[PDB]
Amino acid sequence: PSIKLQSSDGEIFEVDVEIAKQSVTIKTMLEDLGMDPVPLPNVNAAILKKVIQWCTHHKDDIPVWDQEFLKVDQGTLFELILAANYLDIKGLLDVTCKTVANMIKGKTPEEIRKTFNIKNDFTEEEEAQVRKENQWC
Amino acid sequence: VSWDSLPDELLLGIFSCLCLPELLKVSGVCKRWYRLASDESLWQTLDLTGKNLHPDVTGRLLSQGVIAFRCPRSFMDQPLAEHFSPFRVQHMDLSNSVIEVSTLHGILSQCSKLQNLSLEGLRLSDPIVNTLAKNSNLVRLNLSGCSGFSEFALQTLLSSCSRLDELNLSWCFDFTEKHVQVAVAHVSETITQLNLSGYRKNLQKSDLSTLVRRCPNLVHLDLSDSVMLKNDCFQEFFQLNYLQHLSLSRCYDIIPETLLELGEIPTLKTLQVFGIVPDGTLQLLKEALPHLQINCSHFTTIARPTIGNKKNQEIWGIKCRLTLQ
């Protein structure tokens, strides 16, 4: 009924086997390895605590709770998307990506570079074609 | 912190959460996003209906590995007969659009992997019809109302599509007896749904025989508006042991009473005989054949990309993820 998870930095969280199983990654291990302190070298204690929280909330499972849940700085959100991916939790990988999707909506390409801090690989002539290639829309 | 440090698989996730206009926005953020914003995973199903469009946009978009392309009632009337590179497009609906014949050709000349195509209400041409022959894997083809092609180009197309299941080749106002003859003489024996309505004096009984002889697997057979057909055709429908849907609407030479004989076809589930059956003898006909569904439906569903209202973008069941609605 219980399983212990080990963050890439020391912490051990005891989650319900059924909730931990929500992670395909953590699931394959608890089987193809039958380990107790499940080694999670790619997720630190902060993010994992979040993953477990999100999975607990949806143990039976954008909602308001999720929105408040993902109401964190870009860094944490970037860490969760990775975590969710690494732990392969389709559920939480879906909301986090849509959250980032909602962030892009409205903002212009410039406002987007600002936020997510993205280098403009473009040439004013390339943005000229990218634009032309998208006029029809 | 920067997100450009995010895995390629994840940006695609985020991008999959964006609607068409949003996706084209992001494509202009950085060169990376631009590459990814056109990733094949993002463009499988595209719905651009009633959109006026330049052939280069349709080509450049079809060149991104697009499988289901819904585009009825659209407008493509300019140069550059797509030659872009071969297209993955499998399911495509260009019905009732206005497309320069050379633009129609250019796009279909980059298609070989089509499974379901609709060119309903489109002026075509042998060059066009012949390029369609490439799509031998065609399962459903709709050329209803099309014109501009010979019975010879039609012949190589039908000869070539040997696994065709549904074929709506009705009301090609463009053609003669020969087209009808070619039609029944070369439709694949694999055919199960055929709509050849609209050819009055050009569809003889003998053409019905040929069809019946070569195609025993017909489940749907629409012969509406077959002015020549008399009840003495019924002996041909009897030789189809899987026919469960027949249409003879507007076949004025079929005496309403003789319709009782269609009770011989055991598998028959529905009969459509509009415009030749008096309301009275029609309700008596329904009395006699309680197993049938008479004049229950007005429109053909044979090889139709979509059937319904508010139910658009279900191009042969596919709910196009990218649209402009």
From Swiss-Prot, chain A:
CDD domains listed in its UniProt record: BTB_POZ_SKP1
Gene Ontology annotations of biological process type: chromatin remodeling; maintenance of protein location in nucleus; positive regulation of ubiquitin protein ligase activity; proteasome-mediated ubiquitin-dependent protein catabolic process; protein K48-linked ubiquitination; protein monoubiquitination; protein polyubiquitination; protein ubiquitination
Swiss-Prot/TrEMBL keywords: Host-virus interaction, Isopeptide bond, Phosphoprotein, Ubl conjugation, Ubl conjugation pathway
Pathway listed: Protein modification; protein ubiquitination
Annotated spans, Interaction with the F-box domain of F-box proteins: 81-137
Linked residues for Glycyl lysine isopeptide (Lys-Gly) (interchain with G-Cter in SUMO1): 119
Pfam families, A to Z: Skp1, Skp1_POZ
Domain of life assignment: Eukaryota
Post-translational modification: Undergoes autophagy-mediated degradation in the liver in a time-dependent manner.
Gene Ontology molecular functions: beta-catenin binding; cullin family protein binding; F-box domain binding; molecular function activator activity; protein domain specific binding; ubiquitin ligase complex scaffold activity; ubiquitin-like ligase-substrate adaptor activity
Residue positions, PTM Phosphothreonine: 108
InterPro entries per record: SKP1 (IPR016897), SKP1-like (IPR001232), SKP1-like_dim_sf (IPR036296), SKP1/BTB/POZ_sf (IPR011333), Skp1_comp_dimer (IPR016072), Skp1_comp_POZ (IPR016073)
A GO term from the CC aspect: cytoplasm
SUPFAM superfamilies from the UniProt entry: POZ domain, Skp1 dimerisation domain-like
PANTHER family membership: SKP1 (PTHR11165)
Assembly behavior: Interacts with KDM2B, forming heterodimers. The KDM2B-SKP1 heterodimeric complex interacts with the PCGF1-BCORL heterodimeric complex to form a homotetrameric polycomb repression complex 1 (PRC1.1). Component of multiple SCF (SKP1-CUL1-F-box) E3 ubiquitin-protein ligase complexes formed of CUL1, SKP1, RBX1 and a variable F-box domain-containing protein as substrate-specific subunit. Component of the SCF(FBXW11) complex containing FBXW11. Component of the SCF(SKP2) complex containing SKP2, in which it interacts directly with SKP1, SKP2 and RBX1. (Microbial infection) Interacts with vaccinia virus protein C9L.
Function (record text): Essential component of the SCF (SKP1-CUL1-F-box protein) ubiquitin ligase complex, which mediates the ubiquitination of proteins involved in cell cycle progression, signal transduction and transcription. In the SCF complex, serves as an adapter that links the F-box protein to CUL1. The functional specificity of the SCF complex depends on the F-box protein as substrate recognition component. SCF(BTRC) and SCF(FBXW11) direct ubiquitination of CTNNB1 and participate in Wnt signaling. SCF(FBXW11) directs ubiquitination of phosphorylated NFKBIA.
Family listed: Belongs to the SKP1 family.
Listed name of the protein: S-phase kinase-associated protein 1
GN (gene name): SKP1
From Swiss-Prot, chain B:
Region (Mediates interaction with IFI27): 308-325
Gene: SKP2
LRR-type repeats, residues: 57-82, 83-110, 116-140, 141-163, 164-190, 192-214, 215-236, 240-262, 265-284, 286-307
Any single GO CC term annotated in Swiss-Prot or TrEMBL for this entry: cytosol
Lineage: Eukaryota, Metazoa, Chordata, Craniata, Vertebrata
GO molecular function annotations of the record: identical protein binding; ubiquitin-like ligase-substrate adaptor activity
Subcellular location: Cytoplasm; Nucleus
This protein's UniProt keywords: Acetylation, Antiviral defense, Cytoplasm, Host-virus interaction, Immunity, Innate immunity, Leucine-rich repeat, Nucleus, Phosphoprotein, Repeat, Ubl conjugation, Ubl conjugation pathway
Protein name: S-phase kinase-associated protein 2
Function (record text): Substrate recognition component of a SCF (SKP1-CUL1-F-box protein) E3 ubiquitin-protein ligase complex which mediates the ubiquitination and subsequent proteasomal degradation of target proteins involved in cell cycle progression, signal transduction and transcription. Specifically recognizes phosphorylated CDKN1B/p27kip and is involved in regulation of G1/S transition. Degradation of CDKN1B/p27kip also requires CKS1. Recognizes target proteins ORC1, CDT1, RBL2, KMT2A/MLL1, CDK9, RAG2, NBN, FOXO1, UBP43, YTHDF2, and probably MYC, TOB1 and TAL1. Degradation of TAL1 also requires STUB1. Through the ubiquitin-mediated proteasomal degradation of hepatitis C virus non-structural protein 5A, has an antiviral activity towards that virus.
Pathway as given in its UniProt record: Protein modification; protein ubiquitination
Residues of the F-box domain: 1-46
Residues with the Phosphoserine modification: 85
Post-translational modification: Phosphorylated on serine and threonine resudues in response to DNA damage, promoting 'Lys-63'-linked ubiquitination of NBN.
Transmembrane as UniProt keyword: no
The protein's assembly and partners: Part of a SCF(SKP2) complex consisting of CUL1, RBX1, SKP1 and SKP2. Component of a SCF(SKP2)-like complex containing CUL1, SKP1, TRIM21 and SKP2. Interacts directly with CUL1 and SKP1. Interacts with CKS1. Interacts with ASB2 which is the substrate-recognition component of a probable ECS E3 ubiquitin-protein ligase complex; ASB2 is likely to bridge the formation of dimeric E3-ubiquitin-protein ligase complexes composed of an ECS complex and an SCF(SKP2) complex. Interacts with the cyclin-A-CDK2 complex. (Microbial infection) Interacts with hepatitis C virus/HCV non-structural protein NS5A; promotes the ubiquitin-mediated proteasomal degradation of NS5A.
GO biological process: cellular response to cell-matrix adhesion; defense response to virus; G1/S transition of mitotic cell cycle; G2/M transition of mitotic cell cycle; innate immune response; positive regulation of double-strand break repair via homologous recombination; positive regulation of intracellular estrogen receptor signaling pathway; positive regulation of protein polyubiquitination
Species annotation: Homo sapiens (Human)
Full-sequence portion shown in this chain: 95 to 419 of 424
